[PDB]
Ligand SMILES: [Cl-]
């Protein structure tokens with residue numbers, strides 16, 4: 001019962017999308033909280049003397065995949081399978097597909113893709129395409145562009161007459177209610193889930209997004225067809241621009257993301273005042289609080305980092321270090337969202353956040369001690385004033 | 393609105409427990425998953441010429457505490473407050489109590505306790521007691537025994553003619569059906585939630601549990617009255633041996649805890665085989681799996697560590713390092729449940745830039761017996777069999 005889409009999306013070339021909307025999944029990569037779900041998109045190109053399958057579905061949906069595929073083509077007539085990326089969320093249906101096809105097919109992948117298909121599935125008959133290589137298949141020119149580390153070294157994109165099959169590149173979370181970018185309302189709601197996808201999945205490799213976009217700018221792109229989320233037929237440059245904007249960490253003016261843990265309320269009281277001072281100074285804080293009642297999603301925290309003007313952390317000391325969920329959060333921010341942005345740290349003295357961040361691009365403006373009873377609130381207002389002046 | 397208990401639990405001396413069952417908290421210390429909730433237990437000792445309050449309730453429950461306390465005594469007749477531990481889950485109600493008392497009392501605490509009461513609450517006039525010090529209050533001898541780092545430096549226990557008011561020491565999660573250790577089924581249910589409490593709260597300082605237990609070995613204890621969970625009037629030594637058992641990590645024969653992350657199911661396939669092999673060699677596996685559908689509570693994983701004979705880890709590789717949730721789990725295990733036990737590691741061979749899983753446990757007290765590679769198709773079943781055989785050889 002997940003929703004399945006199968007639609008013809010171009011007449012010439014004759015191209016179908018096969019999309020399943022995973023509303024079963026709760027954690028992408030087994031960690032990122034995605035209550036909004038994610039889709040898996042595969043494509044079929046039907047030509048004279050060729051039927052080209054591009055990517056696939058997650059392995060637990062392999063049966064639904066063959067059933068949906070069978071409605072648009074007899075799998076026995078498939079001659080080529082292009083694998084832009086071998087991660088099983090896109091490639092999990094491949095062994096079932098190859099068995100269903102029941103005879104040899106040409107399988108096309110990057111150099112690293114072939115090694116992964118071999119390791120994962122025992123697949124041996126893989127044709128390796130190199131960067132810029134062109135193949136004539138069913139009378140049409142397929143061009144293959146290596147875009148490595150987006151987010152694995154096997155990642156490539158397939159170019160067909162202006163149509164880019166890009167798998168992860170251009171992906172996003174969320175199950176949109178149409179296939180494509182033909183509705184503004186849908187596009188605007190979708191984009192933050194693209195942001196969430198970029199950071200959680202590709203964030204460590206964001207510099208490769210800039211190189212990737214640069215490599216692709218040489219090509220005339222009419223449409224972008226990714227392996228997840230919306231297809232872009234009307235304005236592919238808008239999706240690419242967004243990828244770049246997230247990668248660079250272009251800030252929204254006024255946006256400050258505040259993240260803290262609060263066990264007894266001593267941190268909460270300092271934080272509540274910091275947040276008020278932010279508002280009172282014209283800022284729009286987005287607040288993530290770890291407490292004995294509430295637990296934010298790390299995927300949501302990460303999603304909010306790239307377009308923040310600045311970050312604020314409130315940190316309890318805990319034993320020899322700091323609070324475990326703050327350690328975890330800082331470590332993920334450093335790994336996936338390492339941006340050159342200003343930070344305030346507020347902390348309780350124990351019996352540190354600094355050394356974690358000190359090999360990052362983040363620059364701590366000041367540290368402020370969170371005290372209990374003798375807490376001088378003047379030093380809160382002072383830290384916020386310092387931030388505002390930095391941002392002027 | 394929480395279940396409150398109010399009950400005389402001793403006639404001589406006259407002692408009341410005030411216990412509230414916190415069914416609102418979801419995470420203790422804002423991290424430990426506790427759907428079973430936790431209680432806060434304060435006590436009142438009524439003496440000739442004295443009324444001694446011992447510890448209190450969490451801050452968000454101050455009003456409920458006051459009204460509760462008021463039914464067993466007029467607060468203005470309170471002469472002494474003993475603060476065994478200053479953490480706000482037990483001390484939060486104190487300022488509202490002082491306010492209601494309305495006149496000066498003797499507030500008793502450890503050296504560190506006094507400094508913290510000032511830091512948290514601005515409370516300044518506190519009587520410091522030292523290790524083994526006795527004060528005569530209301531015709532009775534109160535003895536104070538410092539039990540440091542259980543789990544803070546301020547921690548002490550109060551000894552009153554064989555009755556031990558121990559706050560966190562001897563505490564547990566869970567909101568038991570009754571007050572004391574009078575029902576075996578209840579005791580048996582409750583004890584794993586004590587282990588859960590020990591590891592999550594005190595596990596980092598488990599060596600001080602041993603120091604503390606034997607420090608109290610010279611005291612005739614007929615009752616142990618903690619600040620969380622069950623009271624022990626029938627067999628306090630049973631609870632004490634449990635604390636000691638968890639701290640030493642005494643193993644339940646045959647018990648193995650298997651912890652893995654399965655990003656796509658290749659780890660899962662291998663781990664399922666390992667778990668089958670464990671079973672036919674007579675082990676009873678406890679299994680924790682991070683997948684795209686399910687996510688175990690870290691507090692549950694930690695609780696199962698002390699009496700495990702061995703651990704088995706199944707590890708995905710993720711960029712430079714390891715899986716975030718497995719990193720977190722490993723770091724909390726090292727921090728809270730660092731035991732000298734044998735470990736099997738199963739890991740995917742990644743293309744990470746050349747810290748490793750086995751590098752993390754390398755400094756710790758766990759002993760890695762072997763590493764086995766998780767391969768996709770072409771995985772040799774034989775390799776899993778010999779890892780489990782090697783484990784059974786170690787454990788007998
Ligand atoms: Cl706090």
Ligand SMILES: [Cl-]
Pocket residue numbers: 327328331719720723
């Ligand atoms: Cl962590």
Ligand SMILES: [Cl-]
Pocket residue numbers: 653654655656657658659660708
């Ligand atoms: Cl896996």
